[PDB]
Design a protein around this ligand. Structure first.
Ligand code: HEM
Ligand SMILES: *[C@@H]1O[C@H](CO)[C@@H](O[C@@H]2O[C@H](CO)[C@@H](O)[C@H](O)[C@H]2NC(C)=O)[C@H](O)[C@H]1NC(C)=O
Ligand SMILES: *[C@@H]1O[C@H](CO)[C@@H](O[C@@H]2O[C@H](CO)[C@@H](O)[C@H](O)[C@H]2NC(C)=O)[C@H](O)[C@H]1NC(C)=O
Ligand SMILES: *[C@@H]1O[C@H](CO)[C@@H](O)[C@H](O)[C@H]1NC(C)=O
Ligand SMILES: [Ca+2]
Ligand SMILES: [Zn+2]
Length: 595
């Protein structure tokens, strides 16, 4: 009847109350409700889901059924008319390095993943949805509007499969459909260690009692470790280049090889675990492998939290940072730490920060070889350009010395993502991440733009002129009104990203509120927050305050010249220092004395 808890899956609650370490699943963090923030449960609903039929059909599903009296426009038509641009000149962020973009993706992948339903195992609709563009069950194809050039070269649609949902994926559940978060809601390095026990063990080196993560046994980066290969088929990293046949990496997170700089960041974090585990073994030779793994895992989780909340979030939220994330006042076990469904769309502001090219730079921060700069689309599921072209150092120098794309109301998403995206099992560099995001907002039953404005205490524009004023842009407001016909129908991904950025920040007021609230909750609601008294000793916390992405690079690469503020736009050599001058993480406070 009430159906308070639909929890047939993952019923197991076997909580050690005493454990100084996190579970891999996120279970037991909250003592009163131990499933809160656990992986493989429903995304939180801050507002009730909004479906065409009130339960699970997306707006746009039934041609005849309006939203508030108007047909919702095709995701791809919004993408073409609003999100696309031609000229990559002038589009770079003069005050954010490319590392700023890349850290956002890292944090996002630690916090949330809504994987497509697996109803494609030995299924026709796996290829049939792509082949015949026929909407049904989990097939919700992105149809091309009539004037779309892709209609001329790529057929009628782009394939799209509905996200997985809680209480059996194929059939009906208690009231509205709730999509799954497959990773831990805590900011806990689940993207390095995994959110499931099987994966987390596969990633470990259990051959030695050294608490190490498994490393590649077939390839080395000038003696430095690579992630292991994912030896499974079919492999998109092999598909791109069947001559090189270099597989995807195997990381804590499914998505680690989606692009070369994400793979690069994952590689830095793995190196850091093993570095930490080796340093701890020197300090504490009596520590067994499990203890070394847990202790290094706990430090790397703290590293990710401190970089995120001290360095990253202030330059995302700008003037809104203090409003939404006041200085820390300790653990609040009444806070809901779960990632919300809306946050998983709010955080996609990163899509508008991705620039059109990636560079490899040499030890003078000068172009590395004759093709030093490459188009982003050639680097989707690309591991062979790492193994076979110079390792991660040239790409890390690019992350430091090159710039994020700046979000621009006239230039939102580069064609490298908007027309050339590669999706596994599709075979073409032909997808549109903007269209996918809009279709997914509808898949997840998102409330529209004005419902979220109301949620955030902001004005709800009802007319062209009101929207013009909110967006500070008359042409953008007119295009959105021509497509939507009411600001109430504007999908949250495009409405949030259309707002001009807050002072000293990189998102508008609506996104600052949605992101701000989520990050407040993941900090306040986390029993294992690095700064929660008892988690670390006061001396440990004194050491941890000195972490920086600059030291992470110095410690885990052959790079000896780094900037002191790695998320800022930094130019070589003026903004760069020797690793010598950069604070180290002093692990002496981890020395464990019994006798
Ligand atoms: C080249 C860089 C990137 C690529 C190729 C990429 C690709 C993708 C793809 C294909 C999806 C899945 C879309 C769907 O099926 O609904 C996605 C989701 C997402 N992306 Fe990106 N992305 C990039 C950068 C970023 C950045 C920089 C951020 C944040 C700052 C970000 C945040 C997200 C979030 C939060 C999701 C939803 C995750 C989930 O809950 O399932 N991405 N991205
Ligand atoms: C697991 O860790 C062991 C212990 O370090 C690794 O084996 C060593 O392998 C390296 C080759 O990369 C050799 O240089 C050393 O001589 C070996 N040392 C010892 C003490 O055996 C093993 O490669 C690791 N396995 C994985 C999958 O990472
Ligand atoms: C597939 O990967 C191979 C293997 O690296 C790439 O070949 C390199 O190709 C260029 C020629 O354009 C040479 O100058 C390099 O020295 C090659 N190395 C080797 C070992 O062959 C090839 O370019 C890739 N093709 C695609 C489609 O990505
Ligand atoms: C604990 O969280 C609850 C619910 O979010 C909040 O209302 C309360 O004020 C919080 N406690 C403190 C001390 O901020
Ligand atoms: Ca996590
Ligand atoms: Zn080297």
């Amino acid at each position: 009847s009430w159906e308070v808890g639909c929890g047939a899956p993952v019923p197991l609650v076997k909580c050690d109350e005493n454990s100084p370490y996190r579970t891999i699943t996120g279970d037991c963090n909250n003592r009163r409700s131990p499933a809160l923030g656990a992986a493989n449960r429903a995304l939180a609903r801050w507002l009730p889901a909004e479906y065409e039929d009130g339960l699970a059909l997306p707006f746009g599903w039934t041609q005849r059924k309006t939203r508030n009296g108007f047909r919702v426009p095709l995701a791809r038509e919004v993408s073409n008319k609003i999100v696309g641009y031609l000229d990559e000149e002038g589009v770079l962020d003069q005050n954010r390095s490319l590392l700023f973009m890349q850290w956002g993706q890292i944090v996002d992948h630690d916090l949330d993943f809504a994987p497509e339903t697996e109803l494609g195992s030995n299924e026709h609709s796996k290829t049939q949805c792509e082949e015949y563009c026929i909407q049904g069950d989990n097939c919700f194809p992105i149809m091309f509007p009539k004037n779309d050039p892709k209609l001329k070269t790529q057929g009628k649609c782009m394939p799209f499969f509905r996200a997985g949902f809680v209480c059996p994926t194929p059939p009906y559940q208690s009231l509205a459909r709730e999509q799954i978060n497959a990773v831990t809601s805590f900011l806990d390095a689940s993207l390095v260690y995994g959110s499931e026990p099987s994966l987390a063990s596969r990633l470990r080196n259990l051959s030695s009692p050294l608490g190490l993560m498994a490393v590649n046994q077939e390839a080395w980066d000038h003696g430095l470790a690579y992630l292991p290969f994912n030896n499974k088929k079919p492999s998109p990293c092999e598909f791109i280049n069947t001559t090189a046949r270099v597989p995807c990496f195997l990381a804590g997170d499914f998505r680690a090889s989606e692009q070369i700089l994400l793979a690069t960041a994952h590689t830095l974090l793995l190196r850091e675990h093993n570095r930490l585990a080796r340093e701890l073994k020197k300090l504490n030779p009596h520590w067994n492998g499990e203890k070394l793994y847990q202790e290094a895992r706990k430090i790397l989780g703290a590293f990710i939290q401190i970089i995120t909340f001290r360095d990253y979030l202030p330059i995302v939220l700008g003037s809104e940072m203090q409003k939404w994330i006041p200085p820390y006042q300790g653990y609040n076990n009444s806070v809901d730490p779960r990632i919300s469904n809306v946050f998983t769309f709010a955080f996609r502001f990163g899509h508008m920060e991705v620039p059109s090219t990636v560079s490899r730079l040499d030890e003078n921060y000068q172009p590395w070889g004759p093709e030093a700069e490459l188009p982003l689309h050639t680097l989707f599921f690309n591991t062979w350009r790492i193994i076979k072209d110079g390792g991660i150092d040239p790409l890390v120098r690019g992350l430091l010395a090159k710039k994020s794309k700046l979000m621009n109301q006239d230039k939102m998403v580069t064609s490298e993502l908007r027309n050339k995206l590669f999706q596994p099992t599709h075979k073409i560099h032909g997808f549109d991440l903007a269209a996918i995001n809009l279709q997914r907002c509808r898949d997840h039953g998102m409330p529209g733009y004005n419902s979220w404005r109301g949620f955030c205490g902001l004005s709800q524009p009802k007319t062209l002129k009101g929207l013009q004023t909110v967006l500070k842009n008359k042409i953008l407001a007119k295009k959105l009104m021509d497509l939507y016909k009411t600001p109430d129908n504007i999908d949250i991904w495009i409405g949030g990203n259309a707002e001009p950025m807050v002072e000293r920040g990189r998102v508008g007021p609506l996104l600052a509120c949605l992101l701000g609230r989520q990050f407040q909750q993941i900090r306040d609601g986390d029993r294992f927050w690095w700064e929660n008294p008892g988690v670390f000793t006061e001396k440990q916390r004194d050491s941890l305050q000195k972490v920086s992405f600059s030291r992470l690079i110095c410690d885990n690469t052959h790079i000896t010249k780094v900037p002191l503020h790695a998320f800022q736009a930094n130019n070589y050599p003026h903004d760069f220092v020797d690793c010598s001058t950069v604070d180290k993480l002093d692990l002496s406070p981890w020395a464990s004395r019994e006798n």
